[PDB]
Amino acid sequence: SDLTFCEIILMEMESHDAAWPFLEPVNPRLVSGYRRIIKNPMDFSTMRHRLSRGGYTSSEEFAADALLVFDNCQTFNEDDSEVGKAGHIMRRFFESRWEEFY
Numbered sequence: 001s002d003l004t005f006c007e008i009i010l011m012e013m014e015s016h017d018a019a020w021p022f023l024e025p026v027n028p029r030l031v032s033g034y035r036r037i038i039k040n041p042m043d044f045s046t047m048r049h050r051l052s053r054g055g056y057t058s059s060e061e062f063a064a065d066a067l068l069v070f071d072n073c074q075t076f077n078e079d080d081s082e083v084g085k086a087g088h089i090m091r092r093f094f095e096s097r098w099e100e101f102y
């Protein structure tokens, strides 16, 4: 049940218009400095893969990964960049849907 809400929220983030930067891992070969700056990469397919495996104990671990996506985004991208702007939309989406359950 704690993971049935995570399925709902992850499904809704995956299909969100602003999700396009976060659907697959950043490729550090294409992004100068990414590997140096982002210690713990995270993205939605990685969360999906881990949810399919059953690798989440509670919903808080799920939220930890979600929040990590948007912490990384705000660490690497300017708030007015195209990726930064998408990340703010996705972050506010996640925080609001999360509170709409817990």
Ligand SMILES: Cc1c[nH]nc1CN1CCN(c2nc(-c3[nH]c(C)c4c3CCCC4=O)cs2)CC1
Pocket (backbone or CB within 6 Å): 020, 021, 022, 023, 026, 031, 072, 073, 076, 077, 083
């Ligand atoms: C499914 C879809 C919908 N619209 N377009 C597509 C296909 N996409 C094509 C473009 N793409 C892209 N991701 C990024 C991306 N993401 C993050 C979290 C980034 C970056 C840049 C470096 C900084 C950073 O932290 C840039 S370009 C991947 C997917």
